[PDB]
């Protein structure tokens, strides 16, 4: 089965920790695994004013929120993927599993 | 015909069909990314959402 695991979150260190955990689990389970594909980061910007009224010098805010995405490939049946993804998941990391 | 006189005006677009989801105001909305909030409430609640000032 050509199963794919997509890993996305806000922070980068928890995503890297859970991704390295998945890679080292697939390595210790004696199974071939492709490397993590580093997707380009999506940047979400809203530039809004600072004064609630219309008085003062025109000063703007620059809010920003970066989103990272990873791609993980395996060559195993479904129960191996569930038993490797159902143990020790980060609280801030969102995971989605897709199969073809 | 008071019931059908009450809604002879269809408000399906324009500034009056959209309101902030916090303070119910119809000025300075943020329609980006499906936020649908005014600028002041977005600045008030922008820390918990995830929008932080870096640049």
């Amino acid at each position: 089965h050509r199963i794919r695991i997509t890993l996305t979150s806000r922070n980068v260190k928890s995503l890297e920790k859970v991704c390295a955990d998945l890679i080292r689990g697939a390595k210790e389970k004696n199974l071939k695994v492709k490397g993590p594909v580093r997707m380009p980061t999506k940047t979400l910007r809203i530039t809004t004013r600072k004064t609630p009224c219309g008085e003062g010098s025109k000063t703007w805010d620059r809010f920003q929120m970066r989103i990272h995405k990873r791609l993980i490939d395996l060559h195993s049946p479904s129960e191996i993927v569930k038993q490797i993804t159902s143990i020790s998941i980060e609280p801030g990391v969102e995971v989605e599993v897709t199969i073809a | 015909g008071h019931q059908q006189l009450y809604w002879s005006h269809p408000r399906k677009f324009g500034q009056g069909s959209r309101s902030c989801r916090v303070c119910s105001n119809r000025h300075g909305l943020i329609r980006k990314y499906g936020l649908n909030m005014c600028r002041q409430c977005f600045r008030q609640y922008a820390k918990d959402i995830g929008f932080i000032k870096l640049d």
């Binding site: 996305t8 979400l44 989103i67 995405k69 | 990314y33 499906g34 918990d48 959402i49």
Partner: peptide
Amino acid sequence: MAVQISKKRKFVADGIFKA
């Protein structure tokens, strides 16, 4: 599902739900 909103909109809705 049949809606499947985008990855940016999902995180925005999660932040709105948290707020």
